[PDB]
From a paper:
To understand how ferlins are organized prior to membrane recruitment and to clarify which conformational rearrangements accompany their membrane binding, we obtained additional cryo-EM structures of Ca2+-bound soluble myoferlin (residues 1–1997) and the closely related dysferlin (residues 1–2017), at overall resolutions of ~3.2 Å and ~3.5 Å, respectively. In the lipid-free state, both ferlins adopt a generally similar ring-like structure, formed by only six C2 domains. The rigid Fercore module is well resolved and has a similar organization in both ferlin structures, including the C2C, C2CD-FerA, and C2D domains. At the same time, like in the lipid-bound state, the anchor loop of C2E wraps around C2F, ~40 Å away from C2E’s β-sheets. As a result of these multiple contacts, the C2F domain appears surrounded on three sides by C2B, C2E, and the poorly resolved and dynamic C2G domain. For example, C2E’s contact interfaces with C2B (~252 Å2), C2D (~347 Å2) and C2F (~235 Å2, excluding the anchor loop) are equally small. Likewise, in the lipid-free state, the C2B-C2F interface involves a relatively small number of residues (~193 Å2) and is not present in all the imaged particles. Finally, the C2G domain, which is flexible in the lipid-free states, binds the reconfigured C2B-C2F interface on both sides to close the myoferlin ring.
Ferlins are ancient membrane proteins with a unique architecture, and play central roles in crucial processes that involve Ca2+-dependent vesicle fusion. Ferlins, such as dysferlin (FER1L1), myoferlin (FER1L3), and otoferlin (FER1L2), form an ancient group of C2 domain Ca2+-sensing proteins present in almost all eukaryotic lineages. The top arch of the ferlin ring, composed of the C2C-C2D region, is rigid and exhibits only little variability across the observed functional states. In contrast, the N-terminal C2B and the C-terminal C2F-C2G domains cycle between alternative conformations and, in response to Ca2+, close the ferlin ring, promoting tight interaction with the target membrane.
Residue numbers in the entry: 198 to 384, 390 to 467, 493 to 915, 1047 to 1095, 1126 to 1401, 1448 to 1508, 1514 to 1779
The structure:
Amino acid sequence: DFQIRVRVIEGRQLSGNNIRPVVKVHVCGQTHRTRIKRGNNPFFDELFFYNVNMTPSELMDEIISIRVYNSHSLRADCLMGEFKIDVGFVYDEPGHAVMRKWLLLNDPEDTSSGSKGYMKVSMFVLGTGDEPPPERRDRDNDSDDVESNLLLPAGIALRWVTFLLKIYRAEDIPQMDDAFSQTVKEIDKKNLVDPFVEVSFAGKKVCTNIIEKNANPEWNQVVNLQIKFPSVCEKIKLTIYDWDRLTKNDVVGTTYLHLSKIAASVGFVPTFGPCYLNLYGSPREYTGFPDPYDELNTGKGEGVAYRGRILVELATFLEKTPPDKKLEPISNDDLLVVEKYQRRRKYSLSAVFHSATMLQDVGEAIQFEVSIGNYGNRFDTTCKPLASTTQYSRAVFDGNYYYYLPWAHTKPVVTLTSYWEDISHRLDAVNTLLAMAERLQTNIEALKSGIQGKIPANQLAELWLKLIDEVIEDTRYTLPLTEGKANVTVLDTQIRKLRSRSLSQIHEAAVRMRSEATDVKSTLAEIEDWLDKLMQLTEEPQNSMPDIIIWMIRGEKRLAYARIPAHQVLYSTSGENASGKYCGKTQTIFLKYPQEKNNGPKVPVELRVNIWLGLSAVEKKFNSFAEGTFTVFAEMYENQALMFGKWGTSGLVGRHKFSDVTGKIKLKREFFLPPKGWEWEGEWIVDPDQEGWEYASLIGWKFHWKQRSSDTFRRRRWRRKMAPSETHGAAAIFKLETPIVSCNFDRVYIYHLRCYVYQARNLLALDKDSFSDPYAHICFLHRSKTTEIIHSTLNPTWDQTIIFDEVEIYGEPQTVLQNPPKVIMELFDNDQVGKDEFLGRSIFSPVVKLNSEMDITPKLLWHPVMNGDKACGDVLVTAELILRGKDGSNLPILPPQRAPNLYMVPQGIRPVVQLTAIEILAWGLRNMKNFQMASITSPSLVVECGGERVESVVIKNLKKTPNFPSSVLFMKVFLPKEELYMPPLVIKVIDHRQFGRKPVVGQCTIERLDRFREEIVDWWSKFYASSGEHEKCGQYIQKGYSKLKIYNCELENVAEFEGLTDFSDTFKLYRGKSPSVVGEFKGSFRIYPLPDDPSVPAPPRQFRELPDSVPQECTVRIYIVRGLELQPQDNNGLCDPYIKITLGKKVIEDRDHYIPNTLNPVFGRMYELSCYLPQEKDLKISVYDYDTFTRDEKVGETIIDLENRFLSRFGSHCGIPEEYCVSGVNTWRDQLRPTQLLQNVARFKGFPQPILSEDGSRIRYGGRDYSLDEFEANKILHQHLGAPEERLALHILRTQGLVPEHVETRTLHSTFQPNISQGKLQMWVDVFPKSLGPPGPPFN
Ligand SMILES: [Ca+2]
Ligand SMILES: [Ca+2]
Ligand SMILES: [Ca+2]
Ligand SMILES: [Ca+2]
Ligand SMILES: [Ca+2]
Ligand SMILES: [Ca+2]
């Protein structure tokens, strides 16, 4: 057996606009398909498996078709085409795998003009039982470096285009040298780097000229690339290196030149610029030891510090094909036209720090630093040093687990002045369509909560009208006037034309949606990719504003970072929507460690900041955004010394009488005066010994509160406030060009928060017993609490409300209503020995309720619990964050207490549970796989549903008796009525192996728990009589014989007998961690409501008629009638078919009764076997092909599971006749008489026993009375008829649904086509247990 593995990963630049791509995968005739995605660039990560049993000389002949289609709402999928490749190519590859290779899409004739898309494809062909070399991860480093399958027939792309990438200059490049060559002259440190740009695209690398010792270089060069005009590679890797002779060239930073943000399928050649592109990487401070964060320099990771920026412009000639003229200087007219794109404007930044919580370290002082680009870097040397950093703060303990900062009403303020290009003509568009995208996403989630919650139809209709009218209103946003702005690029005009086209298209289709349709459920498919169209309109290659990187410094060591993209904080005069989302508004920001892509086990700090950025020509209107009152304190001091036992101001050598805090620099009260926009407030007062004297042991040393024995020097304090005087206002803090500025809040607001932590699911097992002991640290700003520990559970139910009182948060309540701070839950595994282990983190926002009219009861939601990178479980939590009014009167009623100071989740927020009886018919396990290459001998079954546990009796010998002695199990579980909150059912299988081990050899998951609430009078004559094929009314039919029924499909496909699976519903098991087939457990579940009183015992069982559950030896008799339309297997164009049967240890090969040269073989043959049931349940019937000289080919095969035939409630073990007869061809072969079968089916159906009459003429059964004269009226009777009671009871058995005699017609399947009809044939099978005695006479 050979195996084909196919994986689809990604699609990029698929042709056509407004497309909904989907991929159909076909391997060797077996065809499936993927899901439907949105947009131009879908991501799939779908995997499919296939198996064929071809010869090794025939395996390479088949092809792999990965054909792609364009899905439509009202039409069928339209073919796009694909480059199919044979199996010989992937088998010819080293390792037998073309692995993560790209693939082309093609029109079969129009592929010469360009490809129709690209699809990332993984191939592997290997034998069965083998394993692959490992594959994982998502990355974009390998693209278009001949990874795409080249030389497809007549479909090579246009490799004639030349990328005219002009590079102009660069600025602010950080120091990448040790500066030893310059500091020996004792002097210039900011300009020592040797930048060159390694351009890289599709595996082609050209290096530009070197400029030595210039952090503001001027290249003015043209670099030429020769690529295909359709190219899968999305971005050019612009990576500035530092050139060095004695060592490998270090990496300054990496930015990317994205093309498909401009492209339309209407479209043009790739263009860009002239626009600056910002680099990011390691912190700018050079170290003599090699840099630990050098991985972030090469683009791996998002970068933690700004590393300069570079002005480039991309043009494209469809000509010039340059082999050797790869580097030419820029002509001078492009040099004076590029000065219009370098025009600087002054910018102003202010950051008010609101909170900095969830700290774990308490040792040594903390601070923060706000820097944009190079401005604000506290380690860079510059004249007039900026107030770019907050003051030092010492964290205090919140009482329970974490630490917070004592900032309280006095918030730190960081103010700095920068110089950037006025690219606000672009970022106005970026911010406005991002506001469109966020409004559309919020309204989409409103529609999603409407359709999931089943709101009334008028509410859903007015919500959808609000959606459509929102797009109607603000899609009329005119793009900014790109004339008179000197920095407008050619890409700006092309992108503006494309955006106007797309915006007018979605606008007119929004009028169409408003005027043609009312179907709110069909139109959301087009809204959901209108949202993706807005995503494709927002994002930019030309963002030259560097990110506001806001750091955390522990002493002098940089510890944690974040970066805000500066477009959502930039202010502009064009409008509020054209301004940023977080412009002048608070935001919750989780800082990360530098090497961490996302925060892992420990968040360093939950920093909350309010950053405003904008042009300094329009910084006058800070006063609309401003909150509180900005305040600066002027400083001077006075030193005294204890000489001759008395304090005095004289004798201060090295200091002054009036001076600064260290005493070294002389100061006076009027040395610093309030500048323009400022006036003095109040008067110089002592700010505290109650006199204010602070004493130290040495001169200019650390002062403290009171004079000890060793203190011989002292000082004291005076401060004077300065406040904004005129209507210059709070904007005057930019005019302080530095004294420490802080924002004073004159009003405090009280907040009361309740977190409803009900339950979790799918938590990791960090203990040795494959469970955990979870608990949660619920932290919110300057408070935290700890929940209870639920021991030995991976699906815990804490059922606990965590309550915080007196959480003081400043600012207006509308500020916290628009931007609530995050409630963070840190789940841990409680270990009684050692430190607890990190389980995960859930971040969600509380529903802020400022007053009584916002009293929405908060629904619990399954917020993800991220650990590392991936989600590792969910928690069902919510929160509410309320204005605490006067005396807490508007606060809700407290939740009840099951324990002292330990609250429960209250009645309206908890999942509404009702008590159910989950009854499990745990019967048997079939088709086991070896655990660690060792057979299974002693399995047992454990049923779990939301933490409730029941166990079954362990099987002593699986090979001998694979059936549980405990057939019926009970669980009494409070299950939620809502489908969302209701937990999945998990089954465990435990094998009694050596060493007293408890291993899991199989696990099962179930989610659809809503389900379980004259002639010779032979058989050829009777077959023709029932079929009506021959004579159709004749004298044989006029003898009144029993008539069978011919079914053209399977009995399993007959919905009348429920597929013969009702008593034995089959399920699917798994093993290990990412998997494949290990086993199958079957047995019917019955999940029905228990009575509402928990003390009341069980209701009567739904499983009350357990049969003989031990295995029984059974005699089988297989009848084969005729095959139809078989596939030829010979050189003569026909087939010579025969029968091959295997029942476990017994094999029958029906060789010498073959039928020559037919495709319709009338077999008419009788095969008798006897085998152990239900162990050998797999009855395999196959048709093979006679050849007198060659190997027998396989025509087809079908699998019949006889235990489902024997154990069915419909009794398909023996096909009953129409009327009861004792001799001839109609002889009763069943070992149980019709009346005993009637009482048996009364037992299995739960029906009462049949009340026979005194002569058998009347039988009462199943709530209905039956009579013999109803069937015997105008019915011909003949001499084989037996007793009248059995005769009548047989007609009851025929009218009640017990299976009569049939000739079924099964489907053949080959190994090449396991689901396609490889012919047809007719069978009917008889099963008789030997426990009920010997069966009747066999039939010919
Ligand atoms: Ca270097
Ligand atoms: Ca260098
Ligand atoms: Ca543990
Ligand atoms: Ca533990
Ligand atoms: Ca043959
Ligand atoms: Ca043959």
